[PDB]
């Protein structure tokens, strides 16, 4: 930036991070659709078209949650006209606002914004026992708040004849493509999984309760890794050396309502975990995943929902 960033000329600047909407202030429950709230305000005597100002967030804070939209809401004046448009950058964790031609015609502009912000699931990708520090800066004013970040734990069954564990999550909603990504972790706990003789192979069934979800066009990818490489948000680099693509090894059936994967064994070792990624058009409905027999009579089941 050589010039034109007007953040240093803003007056009466205020900025704050708040957690009033959390069910239990002190902890953000990312699997209970919780988030923090950012607000800021200022005045500015005049601006030029194309000038910018920047709201800086800490590296562990984003404007997205599970979304993919970079735009943030426009800033409007009292007449309902547009003062500035803005966008979030994954690179810098900054929100950059650009003043409009309309704004450049005014004098004594007031700006005020409220928006949700989330602990970034790619950065704080696992449940934390201790509080994390979240900050935002606008010129010389800074806000901070501390919160633990919590994700749900896996479903586990540990009996003599059946040992299973599983977890799933809708971890991405793509705005442009109108899709959702539903990820299933098989053996996220890194334990022995087992069905005793007479109980058949271990299977993973992916379906919906309500089956309102259409899976006919699902894109399915299956990866193998050690559990120590798995995050709780499931938003991680799946192209890394720690993951092997085994999609071709484990064929599946799909009747449009259920996807059934035969693991081809009654035993999965503690050091073997699988991740099944299912991408489908965005749809309302609660999806579930299992590690079970084909009839979902025994084993484990985890559910995760979404509403348009
Ligand atoms: Ca929510
Ligand atoms: Ca930064
Ligand atoms: Ca820490
Ligand atoms: Ca773990």
Residue numbers in the entry: 317 to 526, 530 to 627
Text taken from the publication that reported this structure:
GBS strains express either one of two SRR proteins, Srr1 or Srr2. We now report that both Srr1 and Srr2 bind to a specific tandem repeat region of fibrinogen Aα chain. As was previously predicted from sequence and functional analyses, Srr1-BR and Srr2-BR each adopt an overall fold that resembles the binding regions of “microbial surface components recognizing adhesive matrix molecules” (MSCRAMMs), including the well characterized ClfA, ClfB, SdrG, and the likely MSCRAMM UafA.
To assess whether Srr1 and Srr2 could support a DLL mechanism of ligand binding, we determined the crystal structures of S. agalactiae Srr1-BR and Srr2-BR at resolutions of 1.65 and 3.65 Å, respectively. Notably, a bulky amino acid of the N3 domain (Tyr-623 of Srr1 and His-528 of Srr2) significantly constricts the center of each trench. In addition, we have recently shown that Srr1 binds to human fibrinogen via its interaction with the Aα chain of the protein. Sequence comparisons and deletion mutagenesis studies suggest that the interaction between Srr1 and fibrinogen could employ the “dock, lock, and latch” (DLL) mechanism described for several other fibrinogen-binding adhesins, such as ClfB of S. aureus and SdrG of Staphylococcus epidermidis. Deletion of the latch region of Srr1 is associated with reduced GBS binding in vitro to fibrinogen and hBMEC and resulted in attenuated virulence in a mouse model of bacteremia and meningitis. These data indicate that the affinities of Srr1 and Srr2 for fibrinogen are enhanced by a pre-closed latch, consistent with the location of the latch influencing binding affinity.
